Design a protein around this nucleic acid. Structure first.
Lengths: 73, 49, 146, 40
DNA sequence: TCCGATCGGTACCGGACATGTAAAGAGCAGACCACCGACAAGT
């Protein structure tokens, strides 16, 4: 299912300040960031893990390893 | 399909006879249900065999 | 073991769902071994013995509260022993603050554990009182406790 | 916190795939290390 | 009132073709057949 890209950006290790300073020239990005209703890195990572693989109990490292396997390995 | 249904039914009979715990018996019954459903109409529920 | 017919369940609309007034997701969970369904409930027996069951539940809650109080007083006496030890020989204020906040965290953990136990008991009692046929108990441990 | 709610939601997910459901069911119980086997 | 899922359908005649892996081994017993010994009664 669709997820806001701000969640993915935060899950990759970026913060709110990084997103603001990197995508400050766009209005859609700011609107999505204000309407995400989600803060922090661990919460976004857990949400991504739940969306991708429902029914699997998440933890601190399983989601990161899954993301690395999916993309950066 | 008929062989799969018969095999799962016989395995369910053996599991009931032995006295297996509830988890194994429930799993076997679910497998039997899926086998019958695939026999009657393959593709309606889940992935095709 | 009986097996349902795929034609009359996985259809648009679901004939079994219309006949039994059950949502298609509920039927899928029930017939694929994912949630329990209450076939029938003895309303008269539940109503006759409702007061006794409520009294027993209150007794259980009182017992768990007494256990929580015993744990709290054990923590209090351990803290008193620690204070007596700190009075016996001198110590820095930082370690005293550290042990104070550790004790506060431990007592807060005990308090929230007791609160979770009380909430679980309340949920179980509410589920038992609102028990009715054609209701799905999706939690296995809840059904085991019932 | 939110972690407990996420765990509860994950355990209460439908998990339509049969193999995934069986893995979830077998994952509920713990293991026996050295001596509980002898007692059992 | 709006909208993310799910299911239904999408021309005809001619023709064409056939699967690709195995982590083993041993001890004991049961059923059936090709080779045989005796022993008295009917031929």
């Amino acid at each position: 299912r669709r997820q806001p890209v701000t969640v993915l950006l935060k899950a990759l290790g970026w913060t709110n300040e990084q997103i603001v300073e990197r995508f400050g020239f766009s209005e859609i990005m700011m609107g999505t960031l204000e309407k995400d209703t989600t803060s922090g890195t661990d919460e976004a990572l857990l949400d991504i893990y739940r969306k991708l693989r429902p029914g699997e109990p998440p933890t601190k490292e399983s989601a990161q390893t899954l993301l690395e396997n999916l993309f950066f390995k | 399909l008929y062989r799969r249904v018969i095999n799962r039914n016989n395995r369910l009979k053996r599991l009931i006879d032995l006295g297996a715990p509830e988890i194994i018996v429930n799993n076997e019954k679910r497998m039997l249900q899926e086998s019958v459903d695939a026999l009657f109409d393959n593709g309606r529920r889940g992935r095709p065999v | 073991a009986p097996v349902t017919h795929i034609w009359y369940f996985k259809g648009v609309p679901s004939r079994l769902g219309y006949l039994l007034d059950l949502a298609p997701k509920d039927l899928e969970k029930i017939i694929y071994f994912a949630a329990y369904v209450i076939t029938s409930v003895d309303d008269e027996m539940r109503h006759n013995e409702l007061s006794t069951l409520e009294a027993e539940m209150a007794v259980e809650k009182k017992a768990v509260e007494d256990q929580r109080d015993a744990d709290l007083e054990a923590r209090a006496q351990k803290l008193e022993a620690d204070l007596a030890e700190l009075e016996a020989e001198g110590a820095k204020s930082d370690v005293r603050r550290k042990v104070r906040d550790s004790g506060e965290r431990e007592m807060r953990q005990l308090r929230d554990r007791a609160q979770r136990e009380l909430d679980r008991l309340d949920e179980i009692w509410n589920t038992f009182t609102k028990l009715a046929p054609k209701q799905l108990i999706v939690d296995e441990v809840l059904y085991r406790e019932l | 916190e939110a972690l407990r709610q996420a765990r509860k939601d994950a355990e209460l997910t439908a998990s339509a795939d049969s193999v995934r459901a069986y893995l979830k069911q077998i994952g509920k119980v713990a293991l026996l290390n050295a001596e509980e086997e002898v007692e059992l």
